[PDB]
Amino acid sequence: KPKLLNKFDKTIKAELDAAEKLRKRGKIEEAVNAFKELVRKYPQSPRARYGKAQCEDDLAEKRRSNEVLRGAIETYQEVASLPDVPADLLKLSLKRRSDRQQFLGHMRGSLLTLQRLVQLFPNDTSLKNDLGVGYLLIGDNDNAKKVYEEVLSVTPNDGFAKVHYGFILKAQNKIAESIPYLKEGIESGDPGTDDGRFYFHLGDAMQRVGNKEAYKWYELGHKRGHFASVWQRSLYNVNGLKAQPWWTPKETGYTELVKSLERNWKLIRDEGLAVMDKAKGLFLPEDENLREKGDWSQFTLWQQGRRNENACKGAPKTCTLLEKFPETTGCRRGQIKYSIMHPGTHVWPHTGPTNCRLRMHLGLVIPKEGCKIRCANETKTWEEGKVLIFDDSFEHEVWQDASSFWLIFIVDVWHPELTPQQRRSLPAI
């Protein structure tokens, strides 16, 4: 029973209720004028001001307008400025302000709102959980870690804080440490804990430590609608796209691209070798904590469908070749990159983020022994000048145990069943 009416607002409760009804019934433009009149007669009224903000919120939804939402965001702020705001209404208004600030990508501003909310309600642990999510969204795992520690100091049983703390630990490569927190947080069943991200990383942490229990959690995640399957564990998915670990060129439909990669493979190889020899610093160590051991670096020509101009200066013929194929240069959920691994390298079993791409590998320098890739239950080898294709949303793994280096060219393509408008509008990954 949220108490939103301060003493004066109770004296005008009738007019407020009539205005909110118009907003309930959907007469948006009618309610913005009803609440404008209430804001006129009663300029200090928090409930009138909240009505104006909610209507501005709904108007941003119909019109799909960032500018009108900015105005709503300010009005939600104005509610909190007025005298004598009831606590429930104050909390409702600033929470919704932060949420819509996150909508707009004003992640720094959302953070100030959340920090104020925690300052205003230091006993609300859920507001602290929300604050930590704000830190997580701007990539500040350090402050997010501290926040969930503080939650757990006061409410050790809070499941939301548990999983988020585990997520952070796991992201920090505190693999063993993260398992109990992720596991207990999911088992709590608290709101916000039934999230694919936590099934994803609990199972992966279990795998890395050798806990055969890892797949129990993948099944539960599949059963709760988060994973397409136990083997295919991507989280940014389009449902219905055909799903198989290995593809032939013909199945993908990108027959002309495969032809061109294989016909011109040595120019791609030679430019890659030239960068190894003369510009080796362009190869960057893979830094997503996917390397179990060894030496593994990548030289990226395209990411998120954008050409890296300086990188293409080091592979000019290759970039010229690839420009003819928007199915890969426009794959805003994939990359185009050389990859090199040296002997004694092992890539952890892992999954890519999206089922919306397929990953091509063109072999460039493949030692005759020592090198292999598993996708799902099938392990294959590369050939120099030949293309392999797999769906890297399926769990896959690579070993490099040869006596010399391994070099391939990676070309991501849109999943062939994605329509042109899907390819144009899916957010970049």
Partner: peptide, 18 residues
């Protein structure tokens, strides 16, 4: 940070309003 090869980030996309 960006989710190129994996799913390590809390969110892999960036919201830019409507």
């Amino acid at each position: 940070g960006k989710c190129k090869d994996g799913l390590g980030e809390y969110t892999c996309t960036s919201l830019e309003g409507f």
